[PDB]
Ligand binder design. Structure first.
Ligand SMILES: *CC(=O)Nc1ccc(N(C(=O)c2ccco2)[C@@H](C(=O)NCc2ccccc2)c2cccnc2)cc1
Ligand SMILES: *CC(=O)Nc1ccc(N(C(=O)c2ccco2)[C@@H](C(=O)NCc2ccccc2)c2cccnc2)cc1
Lengths: 305, 305
């Protein structure tokens, strides 16, 4: 029935997006209850970003120096606090459109939807993965900072990402909603190594299961392999090592398709050693790793929220 | 700054999604002002779908046989009318969350966002193209019928698609919001030929321009070609013929990159004749055709709504 890179419905997050202006810089903020969250470098000028002393820069700021606009609504700032790399602005009004929510720090390999915003207004939504090296391959222009990443569980929005920087390599870095960067990155305009990225093996396997479910099965052989022998191949091709924890979370997909995980591993080994011979899998000519086993189950079961 | 298949924010559409039940079948409907729109086969049983007489089947239905639920809200149906392949249910309450909207019949090659829904509840959002053969390659399970496709212009939602059927080939067909199918399809469970699909040449070219803008430029040669000579190649590789209308709409991208459209055509010719040599373009190993020139401009300019 088709398989697409699918983002969560963005409505509940759209109603939380605000514009935050501090003197001259304007970023996006996230308005939940009576608190607005945004990147702390909203307080920086251009020159500041080269080597900012955030504690000293914020000391020059008072509540009234922060202007927060929810579309046309004014939020009056009545308190401010720096938490790690995020600034929290207490406002005098609770957001009436605040959804049920939690703040979550995700693991590499997990996926989420990004609501790209500019000047507090939503521009688009897309699905992506936290890379093993804690970067994301987003689509973010100047002014997108403060855009957030999230997952939705039924009624509950779980915020996991706030956007903070573009590395000189064109990939993206940011924090959880407590302001702690993913990976080694700092909010400073200095060159920063992201480190060797790898392909998310358990996600590739999940996507191969999605392919079989949807009719694409040309890559099924009937070799099998062992975990240790497969991991030798995974290492050669810069794939993350597969663990019994990964095999276990693939269990439901293995059960639906009747294809043992180690059998799918042997198919993946042959795809890695021989490529795709100019064929495609679910409309792709590469091995796709930004679908989790949960993502496949959700899209293949029709789970709503 | 990265390039992603990006859907519109789905909030304005989420607030229009309702569940429509007629005796036993439950589909999605679209609630705008005091009218709910949904597929007319909401009135069919399983056996009906093989060869339905929709006029006779609807004659057995009264206003009170239709149950419409907006989350937990009841809409009282006070009128009903069949328009082509859609059923319109007049309800006694205007949707308070009705956005500014228009109904639009799109052209093949144009793109839109789909809000996949089940039982009136949104499941996910993704971007896709109306194929040249008037199918779409969606992700739709049983119960997704009535999900809609749309574009957003600033404040105005333009609805262009309502989902009606899955062809035995696994691709998808549906109507505009006046109930007229795209392509030759009928809402009947019979085998139906979709016809030769082709690749949307102007969109591939737009995406090549996006690649250059974002740093991927290995495919630039300095051959050029002519429209007629390129179209000979386009025909060989089942690409849509390129017209001066297409060249014109690529003008802004040509102006930004300083790369003449016929020069990009020569690059596309070499990519078609020689493939990608195991390299990638914007993270893909295939020539991507579901970005319009407008889509590239929007994502590359940071246009909000
Ligand atoms: C993630 C993100 O949003 N990054 C970002 C980059 C650049 C800016 N700045 C903008 O002006 C801007 C806002 C929207 C589009 O562009 C600058 C800024 O405000 N002044 C920079 C400058 C440069 C040269 C001469 C004068 C001024 C900015 C502000 C603060 C920190 N970095 C960059 C915002 C956000
Ligand atoms: C696009 C779309 O939504 N198509 C669709 C397929 C199948 C159904 N039906 C369902 O039951 C259903 C709803 C959600 C998931 O599945 C059937 C139906 O209601 N009864 C079919 C049936 C088959 C065998 C024995 C008894 C009954 C359906 C209803 C009307 C028309 N076609 C199919 C809904 C929608």
């Amino acid at each position: 029935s088709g398989f697409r890179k699918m983002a969560f419905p963005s409505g509940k997050v759209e109603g939380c997006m605000v514009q935050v202006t501090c003197g001259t810089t304007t970023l996006n903020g996230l308005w939940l209850d009576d608190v607005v969250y945004c990147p702390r470098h909203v307080i920086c000028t251009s020159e500041d970003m080269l080597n900012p002393n955030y504690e000293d820069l914020l000391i020059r700021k008072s509540n009234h120096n922060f202007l927060v606009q929810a579309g046309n609504v004014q939020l009056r700032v009545i308190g401010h606090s720096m938490q790690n790399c995020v600034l929290k602005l207490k406002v005098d009004t609770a957001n009436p459109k605040t959804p049920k929510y939690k703040f979550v720090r995700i693991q590499p390999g997990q996926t989420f939807s990004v609501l790209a915003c500019y000047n507090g207004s939503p521009s688009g939504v897309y699905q992506c993965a936290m890379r093993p090296n804690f970067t994301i391959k987003g689509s973010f222009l100047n002014g997108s900072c403060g855009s957030v990443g999230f997952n939705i569980d039924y009624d509950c929005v779980s915020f996991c990402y706030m956007h903070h920087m573009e590395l000189p390599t064109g990939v993206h870095a940011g924090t959880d909603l407590e302001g702690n960067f993913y990976g080694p990155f700092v909010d400073r305009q200095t060159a920063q190594a992201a480190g060797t990225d790898t392909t998310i093996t358990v996600n590739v396997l999940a996507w191969l299961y999605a392919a079989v479910i949807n009719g694409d099965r040309w890559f099924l052989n009937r070799f099998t392999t062992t975990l240790n022998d497969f991991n030798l191949v995974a290492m050669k091709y810069n794939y993350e090592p597969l663990t019994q924890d990964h095999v276990d979370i693939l269990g439901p997909l293995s059960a639906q398709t009747g294809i043992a995980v180690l059998d799918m591993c042997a198919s993946l080994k042959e795809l890695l050693q021989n490529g795709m011979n100019g064929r495609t899998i679910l409309g792709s000519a590469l091995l796709e790793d930004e679908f989790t086993p949960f993502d496949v189950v959700r899209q293949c079961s029709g789970v709503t929220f």
